Design a protein around this nucleic acid. Structure first.
Lengths: 68, 50, 182, 1105, 321, 185
RNA sequence: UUUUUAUUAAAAAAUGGUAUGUUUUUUUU
RNA sequence: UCUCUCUUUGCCGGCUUAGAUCAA
């Protein structure tokens, strides 16, 4: 991460670890290899929170651009 | 009131600029051990000379 | 060239420039005084000019403190000065004055510095020279420059935007006037 | 994507932009400001006029700036919650700032960055952090009192007094008015201050002021002598002293800037004190550096002294040698000023001591940060060298003791030699045999018997018990890993315990309040029956001494191996293996790295001069040490290759074909860069499996920098004599000079030159220096070596030759055969000039010519204020001249890759882009020169045909109005001057203008035409005979041809080499006519003339005097 | 004081210890009205060594006018004249060789043609007089006469030390001639007489009227001098082409030619390094070929005055004949 | 050509003079004058263009086809430096400067000097090789320790000089800096 | 005790050097 | 209850190597 990390979430159905930071990008660390595999890019400013849907394979992020 | 820059002219009188500092909170005192140290140096210096 | 004796006009321009600029822009301040360098301006401000300096007469308490400290730390006036409260030059001058006064009273009931001439005074610690009635012509011009300097403000290139607005106002007024005369 | 953007639009709105290492700071600031806005909006309760965010943000910015400048930042009217939040966020920002500083400095030290901006930013951060730490240290010193106790100060003063009275030291007096040598000391100080500058125009206000003061001193010196003495007597407070750090990319050197007049006074006091101390014998021989030897000779003397100790190498009865190198860890920082003043009062007059003590208590200021130096020692003063030298003679007395110091130094009237004793009884009476102090590093040599060593280890293990045998886990901190093991220290338990015991004892010898010894800086190397070789590191050299007793192995006596003799038996007893320490290799690497990124490295000549200076400074210090080090050789190859790569990059092409070694290594007067070379050598290799564990024979050679073709660029080391031969020659020459001086004194004859002509430039203090013009002034300049070493704390420019001075030592290196050898190696002057554009200038011979350094126009604009673009172009001018000079080889035709494009209105064919060469060639042809030249040549041809207007083929002759662009089009060429014959002739195959046995009776032809084409030849293909042959055989035989006659004549001109030729069918009369007329033409055209003169103007290559 | 160098035709202002007579005069200067004291800043032992009386100006000036005077009286051999102090022989031969190359003296050392005698009759130097005497062949005597009057009278421009210097430049800004200072002076003189001799105009233009009046007297007396030889003085060039005036000047300043060097200095025809004075307009114009009149030499640089540009082919055609 | 407005220079000598302006603009042009553009616009051609003239030779029509001359193909810089570079002839200046015909002149003067005669002006010409004084007094003896008095391309006129820029190949000062003998006692 | 073999590269754009901003009407009653 | 005046009256561009340098 380039800047401060603001949210972590260990997926209970996948071997992943999603993270987000004030550096405007969301990452998906693969815990079987300890390397970033996915990047989620659309955000106009820093991201302050991150959560995972308990059932669906969908994650939700909220940030400084007044948009979740 | 900053000691470095201001975008406009905005002249500030010297008293206000002086009042914006922490100089008073920082004490200026010297340890007691200097008094015995220097005197010892002065004592032996005279003793060796005599 | 550069230097001199810090006439009163220079000192007051220095005070005004410090008021308008701050204590961390000595290069910009020295641009006002063409005969002085930023180091000289800083030395004078921190040795004679800034209001924190106590120019009053020496009390007995601080005098005994000065004697005690000068006994404790031989030389080392730059560190004795903050404790005593005066500047280093003031403390050293007061110490020498006390020693000379004691020698004078020594003579009533009864050379190393003598073999050479008197100590040339430091330029930044001497009192400002009182101004004459007609301060030459160069000092007048530098005072005028400083006067225009202190009330400039408005940045540097902000004089373009307002000028373009005034020109646009004149052009539109002329256009409306031509429409009206038609 | 291109078509979508074309038919749709930008769709700029609603797109995100990733942070890309340049927006990092400006985005972190935005996030911090947003967070502070949220905190403000929260902690302020309801209905309290929330519109107060901007002022708190201003307070936060001011608090951050105050933190950076180390200012308290107490705001009186600020509420407590706001103040606490601001403090918290400022601490967060400060911690981020410091972490980034650490990361960037580590990266810079490794070498992973080449930014100038990053290096400067990190230098600023390091300066700020160090100054904060130093201010805290001084404040703590004032709070906690004098760290040195009263008892320690009394003991130190008593020992120094006893030592000084034992050697009957006569205290230095204040210099009287009637002092004979004042003018000489003054001029010496003034010269040392002038040596810092040049006649360049970059002098700022302070530099110009000090130069003017120096000039005023030269015009009339005596009133300034009076002023200097008066200031010494009366002045006790001084101006502020600027402070800044000089980046070595591995450590930072503190550089102090002092006021000019105070600098004059300090320099005079320095000279006077060093002359008086040397005249009165204050420093007892073992303090270093000294005027006697350079550092390499000091290493040699240490090796010889170690070898010459009595029974030094014998290990039968359990005797052990410990040679402990160490440095006094933080010893300049712990020099108590009052104790220093009391000590300095012992050596000299009270006035001088007081002046020197008060000069060290100054106000150090960097930018907006300032503090009062009241505890440390300021190394930027001109006399700080002397002040440190006698404060470090105190520590020598503490370490050795008065009796051992007296034994080592000997009687004051008859002092001992450097590393010798009066007799063996006193030499062997103490474990300490040898001792020296190089500024702050201490080298001691211990000679223990069995009982002494056993008792020492038992004492050490009493107080530091070692049940787990952990004393051997971390002993050599990778210090001596350069040597192959079995040449390192074998970590036997007894030897390791002995070394650690010696370190423990010596460290306990010194009080902790003024200095300390760190184990990470100390390495005691033991010689015993277990390990045979002593190892130590003096200055930049790593030395390994292996006595002949313990060798039991045969190795080739390299040039980098010193043979140590024994004066008792006059035979060699040990061999010392010399190599460059890892710190020296890093220093050279960092020096090259800081050469590459610098303001002046824009011009090729400047960077070549920088490379030459760095290379000479390296290879004259470690003469043969740098040869025995295989790591330094590959570093030299790498750094020379990257120096060349800088020049290659500046011309926007780093192809190796474009840059033969003649471009870089040819001497300056021939138009090259004049680069000294050492990366052009083979690097020895041996099997890597046994390279780390034993010294195996050199079985393979890995090539160094490759030279395309067969070229042998001379090595620089082969023109520098190795240190050992210089030392042997010095001893022999000085002994014979002493003998001849004695034979001159026994009679009344005056010793003269042409009597020492054989040993003229020989001896480390060169014999030249005896008959020197200014040897009388130099006879008073003393302590110059320590002063030159300490000059690193006063000037921001690195002194490469810090270890020597040409006035006192003489020119120790004489590299003049390198020029002639590198001229021969490249193929001679003719072979070098075939690459350049010398022929196009039309100059008759090379001997008379000379280059003009500046065009005068440059001299006009060297002070005027110019925009950055104008300064860049003015700097590019010499690069453009250089590129034009080497045009034939840089714009060659045998290139690996490159689009072949023709310059418009011109026949020059460009491979690649190379903007510098293109713009130079455009300037050379700034008007329509190519086509004008073609028309002028054909015009002069028609005139000379008008002369001979009555000949064969005179029935018709006409030169057609050709297509304009027929000069600069080689795809096809239209006709030229036409000839048709009135009768029939017999001609044969066309031939050149060189053959007289030419048959012309094979075929029967009637008509011919003559045409001329212009060629700008390059280095690879310039033989005009083949060019004209092929052009004729291609153009005439071509199925499409706008030449009326089936056969004719084609002639060519090589503009770059001003040659010419022809090929065509010949009719008697025409061939001799063109032979006689072409030569007259080629020296007569206005067009060729103006082309030659404009080329000469561009090259700035003028004729003879 | 001033010392002139014949080998280089330069003049320098050098410091010299005073003579004994000068010291006595300075001591006696004080004490006219009441008793006075002198404090000479040296020792009597220093006084014991200086030479008694300063050497004569006949021994410290240019003898070319002197040789013209004697040759006009009819003295073939210069050694026959009763000099009080013998002048330097090397100076006499230098002046005579200069006069020979000027054409006033023949191979035998006698006055050449009416030219030599007419030059002898002229008060001015032979160099300036040659242009005046040859101007009759070209019908442009008037402007060369004005040039000579300006040169002999002195500097016709006044340079204040205060801010009016910028005003002076602006006052001069109307009359900057591309061809050098000499034609600028000609234009200034023409408009000066064309401005009714108005003294307020001279104040406004910062022009020295006294020098212009003296030039008027000089030109009137030289008009009488030419009329002594029955030479008309109504000859003016009706065309703007100043080239033939420049031919006459190059005939008058044959020795004083120089061409620009790359270093910013100029190479005299005699291989001398000289520097242009800052006063001249063509200070940085980088004119390829230049012609000057007077040379004043300082401790480092030799400065030339009265700068005027020239063309190479005029010089080439003049030297070949 | 109005020489442009000359008031811009005023005083303010070299090290404060703004920058040279070709067209009252702060720019450089020419490859060897510091500009990043040479020719018309980084090109050889010109604004109008350039065409050859008609050619015709018939032993009487080529007579109208004259030769080529120096000036017709050069430009303003080329002619300027052609004027600058013309230096030759000289002769007479070198003969009588620095005596020959002057010896005949001395024959006219009836020199008959035998032993030559000199004047105190020549002692002042010796003063040309003595001093100009250095602001000192008459009796000031001064001091002797305080008196003082290869090629290739250039490093750049703004890159200055230093220890870096000297000749590594040195063979000067053969004997002029060295004494021929030294007192031993 | 006879013989060896080992071969990096490599050019284009923007920074970077003729800034930029301005600029013409068909209805009144 | 008007008019005027005074006084009380809580009060409504950022970042970095101070960005970097500076003699008529």
């Amino acid at each position: 991460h380039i800047a401060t990390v603001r949210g972590l979430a260990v997926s209970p159905r996948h071997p992943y670890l999603f993270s987000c930071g004030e550096d405007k990008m969301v990452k998906c660390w693969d815990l079987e290899t300890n390397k970033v595999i996915r990047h989620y890019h659309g955000h106009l400013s820093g991201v302050y929170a991150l959560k995972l849907h308990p059932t669906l394979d969908v994650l939700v992020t909220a940030g400084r651009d007044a948009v979740a | 009131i900053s000691n470095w820059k201001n975008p406009k002219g905005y002249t500030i009188p010297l008293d206000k600029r002086l009042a914006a500092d922490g100089r008073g909170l920082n004490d200026v005192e010297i340890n007691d051990g200097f008094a015995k140290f220097s005197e010892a140096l002065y004592t032996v210096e005279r003793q060796a000379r005599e | 060239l550069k230097g001199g004796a810090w006439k009163n006009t220079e000192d007051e321009i220095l005070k005004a420039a410090v008021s308008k600029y701050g204590k961390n822009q000595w290069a910009r301040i020295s641009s006002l005084l063409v005969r002085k360098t930023p180091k000289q301006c800083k030395a004078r401000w921190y040795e004679w000019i800034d209001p924190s300096i106590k120019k009053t007469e020496w009390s007995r308490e601080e005098d005994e403190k000065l004697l005690h400290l000068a006994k404790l730390l031989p030389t080392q006036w730059r560190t004795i000065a903050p404790i005593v409260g005066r500047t280093a030059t003031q403390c050293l001058e007061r110490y020498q004055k006390l020693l000379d006064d004691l020698e004078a009273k020594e003579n009533e009931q009864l050379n190393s510095r003598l073999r050479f001439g008197e100590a040339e005074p430091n330029l930044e610690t001497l009192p400002a020279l009182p101004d004459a009635i007609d301060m030459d012509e160069d000092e007048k011009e530098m005072l005028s420059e400083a006067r225009a300097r202190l009330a400039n403000t408005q940045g540097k290139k902000a004089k373009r935007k307002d000028r373009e607005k005034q020109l646009e106002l004149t052009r539109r007024l002329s256009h409306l006037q031509k429409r009206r005369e038609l | 994507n291109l078509l979508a953007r074309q038919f749709e639009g930008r769709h700029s709105t609603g797109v995100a932009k990733q942070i890309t290492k340049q927006r990092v700071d400006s985005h972190q600031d935005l996030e911090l400001r947003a967070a502070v806005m949220n905190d403000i909006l929260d902690m302020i309760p309801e209905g309290i006029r929330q519109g107060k965010s901007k002022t708190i943000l201003q307070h936060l910015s001011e608090a951050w700036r105050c933190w950076k400048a180390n200012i308290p930042w107490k705001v009186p009217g600020l509420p407590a919650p706001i103040e606490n939040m601001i403090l918290r966020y400022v601490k967060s920002k400060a911690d981020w700032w410091t972490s980034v500083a650490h990361f960037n400095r580590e990266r810079i030290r490794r070498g992973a960055t080449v930014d100038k901006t990053v290096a400067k930013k990190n230098l600023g951060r390091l300066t700020r952090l160090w100054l904060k730490a130093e201010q805290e240290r001084q404040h703590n010193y004032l709070k906690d009192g004098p760290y040195v106790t009263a008892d320690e100060a009394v003991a130190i003063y008593t020992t120094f007094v006893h030592w000084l009275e034992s050697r009957r030291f006569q205290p230095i007096p204040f210099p009287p008015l009637s002092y004979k040598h004042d003018t000489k000391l003054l001029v010496l100080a003034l010269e040392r201050l002038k040596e810092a500058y040049s006649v360049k125009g970059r002098l700022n206000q302070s530099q110009r002021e000090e130069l003017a003061l120096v000039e005023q001193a030269y015009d009339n010196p005596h009133e300034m002598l009076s002023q200097i003495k008066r200031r010494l007597l009366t002045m006790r407070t001084f101006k502020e002293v600027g402070i800044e750090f000089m980046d070595m990319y591995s450590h930072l050197i503190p550089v102090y800037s002092v006021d000019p007049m105070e600098k004059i006074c300090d320099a005079y006091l320095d000279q006077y004190l060093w002359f008086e101390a040397d005249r009165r014998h204050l420093f007892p021989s073992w303090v270093k550096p000294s005027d006697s030897e350079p550092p390499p000779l000091l290493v040699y003397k240490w090796c010889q002294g170690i070898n010459n100790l009595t029974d030094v190498w014998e290990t039968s009865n359990g005797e052990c040698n410990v040679l402990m190198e160490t440095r006094l860890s933080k010893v300049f920082e712990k020099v108590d000023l009052t104790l220093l003043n009391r000590l300095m009062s012992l050596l000299m007059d009270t006035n001088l001591a007081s002046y020197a003590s008060a000069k060290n208590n100054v106000v150090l200021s960097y930018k907006d940060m300032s503090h009062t130096n009241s505890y440390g020692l300021v190394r930027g003063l001109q006399f700080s060298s002397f002040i440190w030298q006698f404060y470090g003679l105190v520590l020598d007395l503490l370490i050795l003791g008065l009796q051992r110091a007296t034994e080592i130094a000997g009687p004051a009237d008859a002092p001992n030699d450097f590393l010798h004793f009066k007799d063996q009884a006193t030499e062997t009476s103490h474990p300490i045999r040898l001792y020296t102090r190089y500024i702050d590093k201490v080298y001691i040599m211990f000679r223990f018997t069995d009982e002494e060593s056993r008792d020492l280890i038992q004492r050490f293990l009493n107080e530091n018990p070692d049940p787990t045998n952990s004393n051997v886990v971390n002993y050599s901190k990778g210090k001596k890993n350069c040597w192959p093991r079995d040449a390192r220290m074998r970590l036997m338990k007894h030897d390791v315990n002995l070394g650690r015991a010696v370190f423990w004892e010596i460290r306990n010898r010194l009080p902790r309040s003024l200095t300390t010894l760190e184990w990470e800086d100390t390495f005691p190397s033991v010689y015993s029956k277990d390990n045979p070789n002593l190892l130590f590191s003096m200055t930049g050299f790593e030395v390994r001494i292996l006595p002949k007793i313990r060798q039991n192995e045969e190795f080739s006596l390299k040039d980098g191996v010193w043979n140590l003799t024994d004066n008792r038996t006059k035979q060699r007893t040990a061999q010392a293996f010399i190599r460059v320490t890892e710190d020296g290799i890093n220093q050279f690497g960092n020096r090259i790295r800081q050469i590459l990124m610098s303001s002046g490295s824009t011009t090729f000549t400047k960077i070549a001069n920088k490379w030459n200076t760095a290379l000479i400074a390296l290879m004259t210090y470690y003469r043969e040490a740098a040869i025995s080090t295989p790591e330094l050789l590959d570093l030299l190859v790498k750094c020379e290759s990257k120096i060349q790569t800088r020049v290659k990059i500046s011309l926007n092409s780093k192809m190796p074909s474009r840059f033969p070694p003649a471009v870089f290594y040819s001497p300056k007067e021939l138009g090259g860069l004049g680069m000294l070379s050492m990366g052009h050598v083979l690097i020895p290799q041996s099997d890597l499996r046994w390279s780390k564990q034993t010294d195996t024979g050199i079985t393979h050679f890995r090539s160094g920098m490759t030279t395309n073709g067969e070229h042998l660029i001379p090595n620089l080391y082969r023109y520098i004599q190795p240190w050992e031969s210089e030392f042997i020659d010095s001893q022999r020459v000085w002994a014979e000079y002493a003998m001849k001086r004695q034979e001159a004194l026994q009679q009344n004859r005056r010793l003269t030159l042409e009597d020492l002509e054989d040993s003229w430039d020989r001896g480390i203090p060169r014999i030249n220096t005896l008959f020197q013009k200014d040897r009388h002034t130099l006879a008073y300049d003393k302590g110059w070596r320590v002063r030159t070493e300490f000059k690193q704390y006063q000037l921001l420019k690195n002194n490469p030759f810090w270890w020597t001075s040409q006035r006192h030592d003489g020119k120790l290196w004489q590299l003049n055969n390198y020029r002639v050898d590198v001229i021969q190696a490249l193929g001679g002057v003719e072979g070098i000039l075939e690459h350049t554009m010398f022929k196009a200038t039309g100059f008759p011979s090379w001997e008379g010519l000379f280059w003009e350094k500046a065009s005068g126009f440059e001299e006009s604009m060297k002070f005027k204020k110019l925009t950055n673009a104008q300064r860049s172009g003015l700097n590019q001018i010499p690069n453009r001249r250089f590129t034009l000079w080497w045009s034939p080889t840089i714009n060659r035709a045998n290139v690996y890759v490159g689009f072949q494009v023709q310059l418009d209105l011109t026949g020059i064919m460009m491979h690649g882009k190379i903007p510098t060469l293109k713009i130079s060639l455009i300037q050379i042809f700034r008007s329509h020169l190519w086509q004008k030249i073609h028309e002028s040549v054909v015009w002069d041809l028609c005139q000379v045909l008008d002369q001979e207007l009555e000949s064969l083929q005179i029935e018709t002759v006409q030169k057609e109005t050709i297509h304009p662009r027929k000069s600069y089009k080689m795809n096809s060429s239209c006709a030229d001057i036409l000839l048709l014959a009135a009768y029939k002739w017999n001609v044969s195959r066309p031939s050149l203008l060189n053959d007289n046995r030419d048959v012309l009776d094979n075929t029967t032809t009637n008509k011919y035409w003559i045409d001329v084409q212009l060629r700008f030849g390059d280095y690879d293909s310039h033989d005009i005979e083949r060019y004209t042959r092929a052009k004729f055989l291609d153009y005439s035989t071509d199925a499409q041809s706008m030449y009326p006659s089936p056969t004719g004549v084609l002639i060519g001109i090589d503009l770059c080499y001003n040659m010419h030729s022809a090929y065509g069918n010949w009719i008697p009369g025409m061939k001799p006519l063109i032979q006689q007329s072409m030569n007259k033409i080629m020296k007569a055209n206005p067009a060729l003339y103006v082309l030659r003169e404009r080329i000469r103007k561009g090259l700035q290559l003028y004729a003879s005097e | 004081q001033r010392i002139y160098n014949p080998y280089t035709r330069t003049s320098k202002l050098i410091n010299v210890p005073i003579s004994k007579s000068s010291a006595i005069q300075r001591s006696g200067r004080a004490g006219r009205t009441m008793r006075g004291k002198v404090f000479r800043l040296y020792t009597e032992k220093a006084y014991s060594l200086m030479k008694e009386e300063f050497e004569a100006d006949i021994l410290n000036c240019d003898m070319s006018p002197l040789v013209l005077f004697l040759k006009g009286l009819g003295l073939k051999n210069i050694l026959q004249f009763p000099f009080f102090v013998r002048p330097p022989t090397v100076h006499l031969m230098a002046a005579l060789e200069d006069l020979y190359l000027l054409g006033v003296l023949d191979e035998s050392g006698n006055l050449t043609d009416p030219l030599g005698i007419q030059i002898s009759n002229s008060f001015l130097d032979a160099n300036i007089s040659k242009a005046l005497l040859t101007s009759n062949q070209f019908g442009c005597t008037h402007e060369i006469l004005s040039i000579a009057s300006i040169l002999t009278a002195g500097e016709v421009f006044y340079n204040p030390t205060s801010s009016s210097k910028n005003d002076a430049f602006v006052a001069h800004s109307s009359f900057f001639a591309n061809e050098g200072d000499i034609i600028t002076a000609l234009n200034v003189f023409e408009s000066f007489v064309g401005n009714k001799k108005d003294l307020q105009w001279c104040r406004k233009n910062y022009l020295n009227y006294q020098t212009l009046r003296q030039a008027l007297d000089i030109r009137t007396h030289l008009v009488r001098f030419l009329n002594k030889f029955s030479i008309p003085t109504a000859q003016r060039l009706p065309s703007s082409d100043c080239s033939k005036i420049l031919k006459c000047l190059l005939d008058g300043f044959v020795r004083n030619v120089a061409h620009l060097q790359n270093d910013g200095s100029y190479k005299t025809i005699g291989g001398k390094q000289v520097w242009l004075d800052s006063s001249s307009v063509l200070h940085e114009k980088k004119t390829p070929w230049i012609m000057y009149s007077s040379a004043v030499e300082s401790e480092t640089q030799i400065f030339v005055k009265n700068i005027s540009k020239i063309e190479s082919f005029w010089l080439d055609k003049y030297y070949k004949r | 050509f109005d020489l442009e407005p000359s008031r811009i220079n005023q005083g303010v000598p070299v090290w404060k003079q703004e920058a040279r302006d070709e067209r009252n603009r702060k720019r450089f042009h020419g490859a060897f004058t510091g500009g990043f553009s040479a020719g018309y616009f980084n090109t050889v051609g010109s604004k109008e263009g350039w065409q050859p003239k008609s050619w015709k030779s018939s032993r009487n029509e080529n007579k109208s086809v004259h030769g080529m001359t120096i000036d017709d193909i050069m430009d303003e810089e080329d002619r300027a430096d052609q004027e600058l570079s013309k230096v030759y002839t000289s002769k007479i200046n070198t003969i009588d400067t620095s005596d020959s015909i002057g010896e005949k002149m001395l024959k006219n003067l009836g020199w008959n000097g035998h032993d030559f005669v000199i004047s105190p002006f020549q002692g002042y010409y010796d003063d040309t090789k003595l001093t100009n004084q250095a602001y000192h007094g008459i009796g000031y003896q001064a001091d002797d320790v305080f008196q003082l008095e290869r090629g290739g391309f250039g490093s750049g006129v703004l890159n200055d000089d230093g220890i870096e820029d000297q000749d590594i190949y040195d063979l000067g000062a053969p004997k002029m800096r060295y004494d021929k003998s030294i007192n031993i006692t």
